[PDB]
Amino acid sequence: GRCTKSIPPRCFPD
């Protein structure tokens, strides 16, 4: 449950 704000938005399963 975490996403990069810097694009591309890569979201992690946490």
UniProtKB/Swiss-Prot annotation:
Cross-link Cyclopeptide (Gly-Asp) placement: 1-14
Disulfide bonds: 3-11
PTMs per UniProt: This is a cyclic peptide.
Site entry: Reactive bond: 5-6
Record's function text: Inhibits trypsin, cathepsin G, elastase, chymotrypsin and thrombin. Does not inhibit factor Xa.
Protein name, UniProt field: Trypsin inhibitor 1
Organism name: Helianthus annuus
The organism's taxonomic lineage, starting at the top: Eukaryota, Viridiplantae, Streptophyta, Embryophyta, Tracheophyta
Residue range from the parent sequence: 40 to 53 of 56
